[PDB]
């Protein structure tokens, strides 16, 4: 059908370079303008740069934050768009989308003939880039002990703190998967140190403390480390 497939995204150190590529199909790549759009985690969309057809000269126009560092090119021989990123910064991390753009000529008003309406018509799934000096490191799980300052009537709260790990993917369960009601695993947060950190908490009745045994199972496959932490009530 009609789609765009980005690739080449991954891990790269600050100051390094990285090359993305997008293959196109279902339309005439050569007669189409192309653009890149990135999205940092938890943030909004941001235009990167665009390129024109070879018939127009392949003029490239970029966004200020990337101007001078990134380069866009195209290869109509294989319906492929490229993004050559050099001198990468931590702030360049995100999901990079490829786009086939369209223009609508201005018509109604004569004195604006020549200008147009530019928009992003077709998007790809995207590919994630991550710029970090961090090295693979397993997490250090810590208790979030329940106490008097963590109980609301007949309901106590407890959890586990999975702190200082890298890269992103880590999974958390409770009692080898037995407990799943009232549990909340918050999204990972990137810390100033370049390492990630999340918290997994669960609500339970205060009458089950000292009887029920709660163990949070942490699995961080990248470092190949598994942990089972038993959280006990603290005063």
């Amino acid at each position: 059908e009609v789609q765009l497939v980005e690739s080449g995204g991954g891990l790269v150190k600050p100051g390094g370079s990285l090359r993305l590529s997008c293959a196109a199909s279902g339309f005439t790549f050569s007669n189409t303008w192309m653009s890149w759009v990135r999205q940092a985690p938890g943030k909004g969309l941001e235009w990167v740069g665009r390129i024109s057809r070879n018939k127009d000269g392949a003029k490239t126009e970029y966004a200020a934050p990337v101007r001078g560092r990134f380069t866009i090119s195209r290869d109509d021989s294989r319906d492929t768009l490229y993004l050559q990123m050099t001198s990468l910064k931590i702030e360049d991390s995100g999901r990079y989308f490829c786009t086939a753009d369209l223009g609508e000529p201005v018509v109604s008003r004569f004195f604006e003939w020549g200008s147009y309406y530019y928009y992003m018509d077709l998007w790809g799934k995207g590919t994630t880039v991550t710029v970090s000096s961090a090295s693979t490191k397993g997490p250090s799980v810590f208790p979030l002990a329940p106490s008097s300052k963590s109980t609301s009537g007949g309901t106590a709260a407890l959890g586990c703190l999975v702190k200082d790990y890298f890269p992103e993917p880590v999974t958390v369960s409770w009692n080898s998967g037995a407990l799943t009601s009232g549990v909340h695993t918050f999204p990972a947060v990137l810390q100033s140190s370049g390492l990630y950190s999340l918290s997994s908490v669960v609500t339970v009745p205060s009458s089950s403390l000292g009887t029920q045994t709660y163990i949070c199972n942490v699995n961080h496959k990248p470092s190949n480390t598994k942990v089972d932490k038993r959280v006990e009530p603290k005063s």
């Binding site: 339309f27 005439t28 790549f29 050569s30 007669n31 189409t32 303008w33 024109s52 057809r53 018939k55 127009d56 109509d76 319906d79 369209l102 223009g103 609508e104 000529p105 201005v106 018509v107 004569f110 004195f111 003939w113 020549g114 200008s115 147009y116």
Partner: peptide
């Protein structure tokens, strides 16, 4: 698509929105 367009005719070419704007600009100039 480009391969099937010029498969036979040398003098075949493609037009898009951008050309239109260049014309309305060429007219206005």
């Amino acid at each position: 698509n480009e391969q099937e367009l010029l498969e036979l005719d040398k003098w075949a070419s493609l037009w898009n929105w951008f050309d239109i704007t260049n014309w309305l600009w060429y007219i206005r100039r």
